[PDB]
Write a protein that binds this ligand. Sequence first.
Ligand SMILES: Nc1ncnc2c1ncn2[C@@H]1O[C@H](COP(=O)(O)OP(=O)(O)OP(=O)(O)O)[C@@H](O)[C@H]1O
Ligand SMILES: [Mg+2]
Lengths: 213, 310
Amino acid sequence: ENRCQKALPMAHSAYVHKNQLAQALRVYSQHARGPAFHKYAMQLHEDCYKFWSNGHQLCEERSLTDQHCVHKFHSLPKSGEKPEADRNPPVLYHNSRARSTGACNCGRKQAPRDDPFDIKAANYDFYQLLEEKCCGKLDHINFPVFEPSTPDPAPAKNRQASTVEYLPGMLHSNCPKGLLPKFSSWSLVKLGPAKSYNFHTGLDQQGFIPGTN
Amino acid sequence: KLLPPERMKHSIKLVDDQMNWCDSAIEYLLDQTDVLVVGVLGLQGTGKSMVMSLLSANTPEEDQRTYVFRAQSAEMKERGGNQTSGIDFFITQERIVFLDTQPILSPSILDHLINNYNLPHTYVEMQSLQIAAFLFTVCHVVIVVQDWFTDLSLYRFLQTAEMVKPSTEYYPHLVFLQNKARREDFCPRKLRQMHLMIDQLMAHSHLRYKGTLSMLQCNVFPGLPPDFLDSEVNLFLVPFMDPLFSLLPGYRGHPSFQSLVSKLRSQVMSMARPQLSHTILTEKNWFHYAARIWDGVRKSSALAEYSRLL
Ligand SMILES: Nc1ncnc2c1ncn2[C@@H]1O[C@H](COP(=O)(O)OP(=O)(O)OP(=O)(O)O)[C@@H](O)[C@H]1O
Ligand SMILES: [Mg+2]
């Protein structure tokens, strides 16, 4: 017991966190040992995680472009909650600091685009915001979306379309038949009559490389 | 121009009886590598000196008066005194180092120290612990000789010694030698109990006391299958000194003493030699390392901690 107690202080003054924990454990084991080293080892460890992680506990979430969140461990805002930086943990949206430039549904208008962590932010919200400013007066062929027949429709747990359960993700070959997503990731827009395209001049839209329009 | 350095005729004293180093073995050491070190431990009359002599450079048919390691004499048994003192040293022609050891916790040393710490009783225990730790940190293998089965006090002493040793940890192999065995001890039924007790009494010893030196494969038991034993530990038995129908000898029930001695010697010599420190060592380097280890063990800190507790 005396040897274990004496060895514990040496390891307690030596400390992502996995490497530090392993090094501390090895140092403690090599420093001293006895017939009751399990209790001392457990005490030294558990006083690890408690004071470990929370400090250099990085957010591990990745954007849909494979970029890590730049924030420390943080909570997501609930529906209608504002971001609160001063809470522990902070309440923040994920952010990779990456930016791209994207064109609208019809291609005529470009805007800066933040790196999306959510599929609605990626396939819908960016384009909806641009559509109000560009293509919202053009003719559209709308894709079917989930229409709730109940005030609280459930996500489907993993033939007339379901009105009680929605597809949480995008429609693909492995999805159950008859589920629709809450929003379409696709858009189909009429730019004009066939004569609006001129074979000799190409498309009159911004962002095209010269001669590729 | 390639003759050997020299041949040793008698063992020398590696450590004086006063726990003092004696640097006098370098004259018989070379610069060769891959050396093997064997040590012994036991009680007063177990017979460690005789075993070491018969295993290093002697034969049972020889006489006890010319053994490499001095053995107890008839005039000494009547007085109940010890013969071996300190630590001995001897190296055979195969470059195998053999180290002797004085009895641990023997009443002879205690009585001799009476007419010469708080009381003169913990000194013997600490000397025994010091010798055990030294043999456990600078020797390739340690052989424990027991006069009788299950002393119940040697296991605790071994664990305590290994717990207070000086210092990716190195643990030498441990061999359990049962000297002066009888016919009753050469039965499979008793063998199973012996192995079971040895395994259950040293479950958390951290030493290599199994998987090597299996007497079952040494043809000792012809028809005994290996699966008959749950866990065959490294345990060996050494028996006591050893018209045509009327000349038949008595029934002993155990193999001949010479056969078992030869088998034990062959098994000990054919053992592994793992590295001691984090570097390659030679004979001279090993000697210097052992000297440094002994010096450090003498002026250690764990020993003082254990001393204030008694
Ligand atoms: N297997 C044996 N069969 C018969 N006699 C033995 C056997 N082993 C040892 N003896 C005898 O019993 C005594 C044992 O003392 P020995 O010299 O062998 O060493 P020891 O008991 O280790 O000595 P120490 O007192 O220094 O620890 C000796 O007289 C020896 O001849
Ligand atoms: Mg002796």
